[PDB]
Amino acid sequence: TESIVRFPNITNLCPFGEVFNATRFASVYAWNRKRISNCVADYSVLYNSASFSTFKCYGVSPTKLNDLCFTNVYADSFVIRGDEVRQIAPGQTGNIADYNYKLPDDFTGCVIAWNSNNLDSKVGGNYNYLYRLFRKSNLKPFERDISTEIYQAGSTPCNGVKGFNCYFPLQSYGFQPTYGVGYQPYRVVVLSFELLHAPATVCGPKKSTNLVKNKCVNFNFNGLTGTGVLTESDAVRDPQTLEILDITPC
Amino acid sequence: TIEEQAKTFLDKFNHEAEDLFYQSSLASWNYNTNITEENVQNMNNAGDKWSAFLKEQSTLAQMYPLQEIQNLTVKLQLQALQQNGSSVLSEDKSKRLNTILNTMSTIYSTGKVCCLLLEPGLNEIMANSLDYNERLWAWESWRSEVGKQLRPLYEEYVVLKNEMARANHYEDYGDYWRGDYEVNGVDGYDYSRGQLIEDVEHTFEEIKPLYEHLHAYVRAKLMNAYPSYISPIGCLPAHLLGDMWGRFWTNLYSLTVPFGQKPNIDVTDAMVDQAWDAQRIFKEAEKFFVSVGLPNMTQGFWENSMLTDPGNVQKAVCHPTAWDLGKGDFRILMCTKVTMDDFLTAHHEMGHIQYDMAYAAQPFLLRNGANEGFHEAVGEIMSLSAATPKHLKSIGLLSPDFQEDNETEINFLLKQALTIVGTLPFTYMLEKWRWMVFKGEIPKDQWMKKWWEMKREIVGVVEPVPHDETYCDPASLFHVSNDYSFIRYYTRTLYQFQFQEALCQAAKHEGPLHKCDISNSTEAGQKLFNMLRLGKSEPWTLALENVVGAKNMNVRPLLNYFEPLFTWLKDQNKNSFVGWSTDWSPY
Ligand SMILES: *[C@@H]1O[C@H](CO)[C@@H](O)[C@H](O)[C@H]1NC(C)=O
Ligand SMILES: *[C@@H]1O[C@H](CO)[C@@H](O)[C@H](O)[C@H]1NC(C)=O
Ligand SMILES: *[C@@H]1O[C@H](CO)[C@@H](O)[C@H](O)[C@H]1NC(C)=O
Ligand SMILES: *[C@@H]1O[C@H](CO)[C@@H](O)[C@H](O)[C@H]1NC(C)=O
Ligand SMILES: *[C@@H]1O[C@H](CO)[C@@H](O)[C@H](O)[C@H]1NC(C)=O
Ligand SMILES: *[C@@H]1O[C@H](CO)[C@@H](O)[C@H](O)[C@H]1NC(C)=O
Ligand SMILES: *[C@@H]1O[C@H](CO)[C@@H](O)[C@H](O)[C@H]1NC(C)=O
Ligand SMILES: [Zn+2]
């Protein structure tokens, strides 16, 4: 008969411009996580920015995410090699995915990697960016380690000095303008959409209409679709009125 | 476990060495492109840092047991890293040896005959003057200066190197050099040290008739040049070969012209008329390598590397080289002008580059050819393929019709034989003499006599005037006085033709092998790339197996290459005498 759309009323632009256009990105071994909630999210210009070397969305289609809701969003960002961007994906191994950043199998986000050879690289070497080479055990998904204790390979304890069979774990990236494609810096941003039983906060951008009673009509509440007769009181909670409404199959 | 200890150590080394080597190579490139002041100290500092780092890493790696490691690749890397070299000897002996090498190099660099230096006047004088007396005088003066000045230095160098090599569990310094062609641990592919002393004389006995006929034909042509100067049975003189040491006979092409009516193929004017901007040559070479099926060039290759000379204000080295600086940086340093020689050199350098791009995935210690010969054969076969009339007709510079008369084939094959087959006896004789001298079987008192009798026997060249024991002829050569191995050229000359025949047969090309082409044959490109990518992680026997299907070097494709020339020489020499006599002497 008719279709009604109802999303929570939010007029706050989502701060993707601050994370994507940050002045300095954190090193891969010690990355920074940004929390995003209570915003209207526009994933159009993000996808069609026409300057991203890789935009791969896992779990959900990259285009439908323009009209779905989640509880909140986590955005991670760092800098790696051009040839290691492949290891930022579920079910991959290596020296990055083992010791720095391992995504879990049930990933429900997107990965966006773009070249940054103009900013990070400089003549003589930019030794600011470091990556972890040795570690006793592989990282658990979404884990950060910052300790710089001397990794021990031999039997004799080196007592925290750089002795024989003991190594400094962190090794420095080197960047120059004349490197190859497989060695130039690449800035990587990982978006994870996490949802719980709590009401949704990030939605949009979509219009809304007035609620109706009776008059069996198609509807989508907070991104979930249904067909039936809405009766005042299987059932959904209004995202702008906080009233329980019952659904009856006509 | 020691296995994991070695793996971790190599994991750290790889990164440290990659960084330091990139720094050193970048400094060296910036010097070679810009030879100004303040660029020398930087090169020296980078090289000193790299050498000290290598020595310290060698000392650290010396602790780990070698026989315990068994992964056959970690073991290879550790064995390559464990090379004491000159560190075994005392500091004073090492300093004296370095002084001897430096003063020999300085004496070779600074030589005057009177004024007259070696480059470039003396070589040009010997090339075209074609006068008996003055050429003899120049040759004798150069010998009586250089050999006289480097006798005791060479003896001390011999004894010091021999004892130093004996200190490293090797038999002699010659054995230390021969140890390059060593593989162990792989059954069915092992190659012993002493097997290289064979497979050289044995293979040379196979190529004797062709060299004999060529020598007789050249002798007859020299008889035409100098009527009453050469005996019909006597050997050639040393100063009539057209070169200082007789290593190449190419300068004798003008005298030994098979047919002067038909000129050689020259398309320099074709490139001049169409105004090739010296950049389209590299585009054409890249297109050739793409048509074969090999990867396209890196984007940074076209911008970082230099092809035109920087100008008159700034002077730079024009010696053609292909640099692989690591970290994905490949460059080519070559001053290019319009000439066929520049075209073939561009093809050779891009062959080097396409070899370098293939094994970039290997670890740092294994980024080299399987042996010391595989790196030049791959470069030379590209020039061999691009010199054929087929590919020259493929591009528009050559006329679509031409004549392809057999005289052209005979002339081309004769000219190519004067350079390729005229250098094997000399290289073999020089290396054999040096091996026997280092081994000690030849005493001090019989150096020059043995050298000249071997020259009479194998190469068939007789000195103009006798020399006493105080002379030293071998030390005049560049490689001898600068401590370089000279067996690489002999093996490369055979691997080149082995690879060419294998690629042509895999490309189902019908007809003579000397007019074969590899372009537009993706199967041949794939077969060659399957061996190029290997690097030094496999024994050179198995790497050779991936191309030709044989586990050892062979001279048969080389003989088949010159088959029309061999038949023509047989027919032309059926009348003249065949052989040489050592009894006759010019004096
Ligand atoms: C980042 O900066 C560019 C250039 O100023 C701008 O076009 C873009 O809208 C900014 N934000 C994002 C998310 O790219
Ligand atoms: C947004 O929705 C809430 C629902 O609780 C309402 O109270 C508020 O007035 C709305 N804001 C508007 C209409 O600007
Ligand atoms: C070569 O080095 C000198 C030393 O300062 C420098 O002035 C010059 O610009 C360099 N050449 C080029 C082409 O940059
Ligand atoms: C070590 O052994 C493994 C297992 O066979 C092999 O894959 C690897 O190539 C060997 N070499 C190195 C350097 O890891
Ligand atoms: C280098 O010299 C040390 C000194 O003891 C020795 O242990 C080691 O085996 C030598 N290595 C080689 C490759 O000669
Ligand atoms: C070329 O072929 C012609 C015709 O058979 C022959 O007369 C001539 O001798 C040949 N020339 C050479 C150099 O073989
Ligand atoms: C190889 O094929 C190309 C077609 O792209 C052609 O232009 C070229 O002339 C061919 N090469 C030869 C040697 O015929
Ligand atoms: Zn070369």
Author numbering:
A (entry chain A): 323 to 555, 574 to 590
B (entry chain D): 20 to 133, 141 to 613
Paper text:
Its function is to bind the host receptor ACE2 and mediate the subsequent membrane fusion required for cell entry. Here we have examined the structures and receptor-binding properties of spikes of the B.1.1.7 variant first described in Kent, United Kingdom (now termed Alpha)10,16–19 and the B.1.351 variant first described in South Africa (now termed Beta). Recently emerging variants of SARS-CoV-2 have acquired other substitutions in the spike including a number located at the monomer-monomer interfaces, at the receptor-binding site, and near the furin-cleavage site.
Second, in line with a recent study by Cai et al., we found enhanced binding of ACE2 to Alpha and Beta variant spikes when compared to Wuhan by surface biolayer interferometry. The data show a sixfold increase in binding strength for Alpha spike, and a twofold increase for Beta spike (compared to Wuhan) arising from the shared substitution N501Y in the RBD. The substitution of the asparagine at position 501 in Wuhan for a tyrosine residue in both Alpha & Beta variants leads to an increase in hydrophobic interactions between the aromatic ring of Y501(RBD) and the aromatic ring of Tyr-41(ACE2) and the aliphatic moiety of Lys-353(ACE2), in addition to a charged hydrogen bond between the phenolic hydroxyl of Tyr-501(RBD) and Lys-353(ACE2). The smaller increase in affinity for ACE2 of the Beta spike versus Alpha spike, is consistent with the finding that, whereas Alpha has retained the same salt bridge as Wuhan between Lys-417(RBD) and Asp-30(ACE2), the RBD of Beta has acquired the additional substitution of an asparagine at residue 417 which cannot make the equivalent salt bridge. A substantial proportion of all other spike/ACE2 complexes are dissociated into monomers.
